[PDB]
Design a protein around this ligand. Structure first.
Ligand SMILES: NCCCCNNC(=O)[C@@H]1CCCN1C(=O)OCc1ccccc1
Ligand SMILES: *[C@@H]1O[C@H](CO)[C@@H](O)[C@H](O)C1NC(C)=O
Lengths: 36, 253, 10
């Protein structure tokens, strides 16, 4: 709704919430000069 | 989306479809920022040069979709608009500066496996991620080609943020600080872009600090689709956060 | 090309 967006915001039910990755998210992470 | 791929189910649960009541047509993309607020591009609603001036009653918002044309029974949710708000200083006369708009839903939508809000960036998140070379992600049901088709299912593409100078040297339009451009260089041998029907959609990034998805941009404008030497321009969400808070606090949330 | 939506919505 606002800053940082929400509370549960940006955590996907089918992915982050179950610890599953989508088929291309690595690509993003790798560009940040390798993710967390 | 040009040069994208089919999205996976539940991959962008904040993706919203802007839908014209009659004729029934896909207007634009949008994004779910809370249970009662949708974020989109001002030009999706108001654009005098083309005689475009949509109202609350003209549109429908469709959430949790995958399929572009099918009515997704028991999956998707359709909502009605209570109020539209356009940035007071949106510049449709010259360069689409401040191309941003908020839509308050008539009733709160319930979250589900296919329906979930995106985060809005904070100063530090923006600072850390909005860098040339970092990639973000665009989604939508727009055209597959500048002058083809149309996808059956939601498409997806990941694109790199470009250096402001390159952005400016690529066009004759005057670029503001309220914008950023993205896309591959002709050199890069990797393509993709938003296209007709993708406007208003999200440009998002995933924080490597907290694992959340943040919306950094709104699909705004571009000269053609996937043209060499050309880029896509996006509204800079963070630069406009203040206006967003304001509106949400003064009128609901 | 759009499939008909439910009338409750229109
Ligand atoms: N890669 C394609 C992105 C699609 C973005 N859609 N937005 C738009 O269509 C907006 C609304 C009005 C003009 N505009 C836009 O994209 O303009 C076309 C243009 C811009 C500069 C110079 C010549 C032509
Ligand atoms: C869009 O249409 C409105 C009312 O439904 C206006 O009052 C308004 O001035 C508008 N846009 C103009 C033509 O730019």
């Amino acid at each position: 709704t606002f800053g940082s967006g929400e509370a549960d915001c940006g955590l996907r039910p089918l992915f982050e919430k179950k610890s599953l990755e989508d088929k291309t998210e690595r690509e993003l992470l790798e560009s940040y000069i390798d993710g967390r | 989306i040009v040069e994208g791929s089919d999205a996976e189910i539940g991959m962008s649960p904040w993706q919203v479809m802007l839908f014209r009541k009659s004729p029934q047509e896909l207007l634009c993309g949008a994004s779910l920022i809370s249970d009662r607020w949708v974020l989109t591009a001002a030009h999706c609603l108001l654009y005098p040069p083309w005689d475009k001036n949509f109202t609350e009653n003209d549109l429908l918002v469709r959430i949790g979709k995958h399929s572009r044309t099918r009515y997704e029974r028991n999956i998707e949710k359709i909502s009605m608009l209570e109020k539209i708000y356009i940035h007071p200083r949106y510049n449709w006369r010259e360069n689409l500066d401040r191309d941003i708009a908020l839509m308050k839903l008539k009733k709160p939508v319930a979250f589900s496996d296919y329906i979930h809000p995106v985060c809005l960036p904070d100063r530090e998140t923006a600072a850390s991620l909005l860098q040339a070379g970092y990639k973000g992600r665009v989604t939508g049901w727009g055209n597959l080609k500048e002058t083809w088709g149309q996808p059956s299912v939601l498409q997806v593409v990941n694109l790199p943020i470009v250096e402001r100078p390159v952005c400016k040297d690529s066009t004759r339009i005057r670029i503001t600080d309220n914008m950023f451009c993205a896309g591959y260089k002709p050199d890069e041998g990797k393509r993709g872009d938003a296209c007709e029907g993708d406007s208003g959609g999200p440009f998002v990034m995933k924080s490597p600090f907290n694992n959340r998805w943040y919306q950094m941009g709104i699909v705004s404008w571009g000269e053609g689709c996937d043209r060499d030497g050309k880029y896509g321009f996006y509204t800079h969400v963070f630069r406009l956060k203040k206006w967003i808070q304001k509106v949400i606090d003064q009128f609901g949330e | 090309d759009f499939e008909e939506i439910p009338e409750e919505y229109l």
